[PDB]
Design a binder for this molecule. Structure first.
Ligand SMILES: NS(=O)(=O)c1c(F)c(F)c(SCCO)c(F)c1N[C@H]1CCc2ccccc21
Length: 258
């Protein structure tokens, strides 16, 4: 009886195994755009994905992860609200059963069809496992997806999904360039939070871009053919793998713009 996104193990239950689910800096949150404070001290985000080395794509039973070899100084996030360098380890998405839901963060209560999370760990802690034990261990760049025009740089992901339909499946996934998933603008909101999945550790500086990318209905439809079950088990479509917005508590969301 492990955690998930089904009818009886979802976000509302997670606190029983992971009591920080009710903690002081949980994610996601609703971004009240009127209340977010412009901070002229925030720096442009520096996203340096020029040397990124993807390796593999994995169906982990909750989402799929596109993995990067993070053993060298290659794909890094810095600037913005960050002190120091954070190295890209993987990206994944959260999405809905319908175009009208799927994002984890919301913007003035608006839900997007999906949300991309590029996960980075602070190199001052040496590797990801030690970083997640620290309050400044991770930086997650969140990007909203809306349904409209196709995102060409997404299609190589979408096309491999048939090979990783079910939980535990992986496939080689080299030479994938995450720059093709970025929107035009790097304007962002930022706040201190957590992983949005168990173990819900309070280790994340969130950086959520204001500009959503567009993907086509056909692309998101392919995400929704994935399965949460393993091979040889009854089909459980991988949809609605998002945690709802959590209490903001004693936090301020800062804006890099306007
Ligand atoms: N979505 S997240 O921002 O809270 C997250 C992280 F912040 C992470 F650091 C990690 S580990 C990244 C290194 O393998 C995640 F797996 C996930 N999430 C993955 C892992 C479990 C899960 C379930 C549903 C969608 C995605 C995922």
């Amino acid at each position: 009886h492990h955690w998930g996104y089904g009818k009886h193990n979802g976000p509302e239950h997670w606190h029983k195994d992971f009591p920080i689910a009710k903690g002081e800096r949980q994610s996601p949150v609703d971004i009240d755009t009127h209340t977010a404070k412009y901070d002229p001290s925030l720096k442009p985000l520096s996203v340096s994905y020029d040397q990124a080395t993807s390796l593999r794509i994995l169906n982990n039973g909750h989402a799929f992860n596109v993995e990067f070899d993070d053993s060298q100084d290659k794909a890094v996030l810095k600037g913005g609200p960050l002190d120091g360098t954070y190295r890209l380890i993987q990206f994944h998405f959260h999405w809905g059963s319908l175009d009208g839901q799927g994002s984890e963060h919301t913007v003035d209560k608006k839900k997007y069809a999906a949300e991309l999370h590029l996960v980075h760990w602070n190199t001052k802690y040496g590797d990801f496992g030690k970083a997640v034990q620290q309050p400044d261990g991770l930086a997650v760049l969140g990007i909203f997806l809306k349904v409209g025009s196709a995102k060409p740089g997404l299609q190589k992901v979408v096309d491999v999904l048939d090979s990783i339909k079910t939980k535990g499946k992986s496939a080689d996934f080299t030479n994938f360039d995450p720059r093709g998933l970025l929107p035009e603008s790097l304007d962002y909101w930022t706040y201190p939070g957590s992983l949005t999945t168990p173990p819900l550790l309070e280790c994340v500086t969130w950086i959520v871009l204001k500009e959503p990318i567009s993907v086509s209905s056909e692309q998101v439809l392919k995400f929704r053919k994935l399965n949460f079950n393993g091979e040889g088990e009854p089909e459980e479509l991988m949809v609605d793998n998002w945690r709802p917005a959590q209490p903001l508590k004693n936090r301020q969301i800062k804006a890099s713009f306007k």
